Amino acid sequence: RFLKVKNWETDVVLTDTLHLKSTLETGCTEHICMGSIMLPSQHTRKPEDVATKDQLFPLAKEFLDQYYSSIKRFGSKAHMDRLEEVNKEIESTSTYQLKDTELIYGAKHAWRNASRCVGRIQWSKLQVFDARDCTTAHGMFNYICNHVKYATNKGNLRSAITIFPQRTDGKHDFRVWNSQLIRYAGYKQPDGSTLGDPANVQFTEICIQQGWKAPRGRFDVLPLLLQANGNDPELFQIPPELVLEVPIRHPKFDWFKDLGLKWYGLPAVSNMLLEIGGLEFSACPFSGWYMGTEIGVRDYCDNSRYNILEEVAKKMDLDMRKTSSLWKDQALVEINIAVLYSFQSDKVTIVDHHSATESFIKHMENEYRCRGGCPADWVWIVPPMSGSITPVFHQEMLNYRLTPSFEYQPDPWNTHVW
Numbered sequence: 001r002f003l004k005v006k007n008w009e010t011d012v013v014l015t016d017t018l019h020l021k022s023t024l025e026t027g028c029t030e031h032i033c034m035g036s037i038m039l040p041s042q043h044t045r046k047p048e049d050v051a052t053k054d055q056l057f058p059l060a061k062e063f064l065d066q067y068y069s070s071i072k073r074f075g076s077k078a079h080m081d082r083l084e085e086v087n088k089e090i091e092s093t094s095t096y097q098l099k100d101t102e103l104i105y106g107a108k109h110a111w112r113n114a115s116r117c118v119g120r121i122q123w124s125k126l127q128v129f130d131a132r133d134c135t136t137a138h139g140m141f142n143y144i145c146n147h148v149k150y151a152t153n154k155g156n157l158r159s160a161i162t163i164f165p166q167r168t169d170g171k172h173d174f175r176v177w178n179s180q181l182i183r184y185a186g187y188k189q190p191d192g193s194t195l196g197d198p199a200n201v202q203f204t205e206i207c208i209q210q211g212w213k214a215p216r217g218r219f220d221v222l223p224l225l226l227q228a229n230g231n232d233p234e235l236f237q238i239p240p241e242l243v244l245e246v247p248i249r250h251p252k253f254d255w256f257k258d259l260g261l262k263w264y265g266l267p268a269v270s271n272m273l274l275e276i277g278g279l280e281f282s283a284c285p286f287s288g289w290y291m292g293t294e295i296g297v298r299d300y301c302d303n304s305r306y307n308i309l310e311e312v313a314k315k316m317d318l319d320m321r322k323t324s325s326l327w328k329d330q331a332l333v334e335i336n337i338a339v340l341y342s343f344q345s346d347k348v349t350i351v352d353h354h355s356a357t358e359s360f361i362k363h364m365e366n367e368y369r370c371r372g373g374c375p376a377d378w379v380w381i382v383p384p385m386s387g388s389i390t391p392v393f394h395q396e397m398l399n400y401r402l403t404p405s406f407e408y409q410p411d412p413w414n415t416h417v418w
């Protein structure tokens with residue numbers, strides 16, 4: 001009931017007691033482990049799972065008890081009256097509203113509890129933008145531009161989240177239909193192949209079906225498609241001066257510029273759902289900075305993404321006949337050297353997978369010491385390249401689900417009553 005986790009590189013043992021406070025389920029049973037299912041049935045919030053008023057107060061109490069425990073005023077009159085006040089408000093409204101202080105605590109701890117995030121060492125330095133007074137898609141557009149400009153900070157990137165009004169009935173739902181705020185377009189070709197980013201080919205067409213005029217090229221920054229209070233979503237173009245991009249060059253290979261690759265500086269997930277004290281925030285774009293491998297390995301070299309191992313090994317002139325020449329591996333390392341070098345020489349914040357995984361072990365030690373545990377998903381924490389030469393490969397990690405949390409949710413174009 002007080003489980004142990006070992007680092008087999010260092011023989012370090014940590015003791016997890018935090019998992020006891022866990023409430024959500026994981027998908028695994030005593031007889032089957034689901035730790036490699038990408039979007040487990042549990043990790044999703046459908047708009048039908050509107051917690052009724054009966055369900056709402058325990059969730060509200062539980063969250064309020066840890067918040068007041070966090071500010072060392074647990075059990076005081078202030079806690080008791082806030083407990084009573086929200087109880088009364090859930091009676092009256094069948095929902096309730098978070099204080100600004102409770103919203104910042106909730107948001108920071110959803111990040112803190114994100115077992116799949118390797119960058120959590122920074123969880124307490126997060127800038128919370130309260131957009132719960134927003135009412136229109138134009139207002140959403142304005143909040144989001146302000147978020148991008150703030151978080152980008154001229155390349156000195158700053159973590160942030162913008163929180164739009166919470167779900168109520170489920171049919172009046174604020175949603176950012178983009179999966180990230182800044183993404184490159186993807187166009188299918190007349191010959192079947194794909195221009196830009198194959199991930200977004202359906203989303204790119206949805207923007208055109210709603211009227212987007214596509215420059216039909218590679219790295220075309222998509223428009224924001226914003227839905228407000230359940231209304232049909234409307235297209236907006238982020239001012240280009242607000243979208244900071246890094247041209248990718250290599251510190252040895254001068255032919256690397258002619259590849260003509262670039263990437264945006266700001267990773268800003270926009271499709272997920274923030275859950276706090278039983279309330280569901282369907283639109284909550286949050287941004288940080290990139291770990292290099294996200295761009296260099298997954299974005300650039302996933303078979304179904306930009307898939308550039310081909311041309312890079314070509315220009316490196318590699319033994320591309322044999323599978324066992326590791327030409328793929330060889331081109332992958334050079335590509336990721338280039339991503340880091342470009343961002344750093346341009347003063348845009350980026351972290352390499354070695355520094356990031358070291359910081360997460362260090363972060364893990366802090367959580368087990370001053371919190372009693374740290375939920376962690378090894379399948380996601382280990383970087384997609386050079387796994388065992390980073391310290392997180394050798395670290396045992398207990399995965400469990402704590403609230404407040406970030407959840408996945410259906411893409412809005414499958415649930416929307418147009």
Ligand code: HEM
Nearest residue numbers: 111114116117118119122159161286287288289290291406
């Ligand atoms: C500050 C710098 C940050 C870095 C370097 C970072 C890094 C990462 C990486 C590498 C992943 C794996 C995703 C993938 O490989 O496709 C991830 C996932 C994730 N990040 Fe972080 N992140 C940062 C900040 C944040 C912030 C500010 C939030 C929210 C406020 C956040 C929440 C999440 C969540 C919720 C997931 C995974 C969702 C899931 O499937 O469970 N991260 N992050």
Ligand SMILES: CNCc1cc(-c2cc(C)cc(N)n2)cc(C(F)(F)F)c1
Nearest residue numbers: 267268269286287288289290291294298
């Ligand atoms: C390969 N990058 C795609 C991807 C990136 C990120 C992400 C998010 C943040 C705030 C920072 C960062 N550095 N990355 C999060 C996800 C997801 F969807 F898992 F949450 C996916």
Ligand SMILES: C[C@H](O)[C@H](O)[C@H]1CNc2nc(N)[nH]c(=O)c2N1
Nearest residue numbers: 035036037038379380381382384
């Ligand atoms: C099948 C598997 O669950 C899926 O490929 C996961 C594995 N681990 C991952 N880890 C990270 N960081 N990001 C991912 O997209 C994935 N994908």
Ligand SMILES: [Zn+2]
Nearest residue numbers: 028033034035
């Ligand atoms: Zn399991």
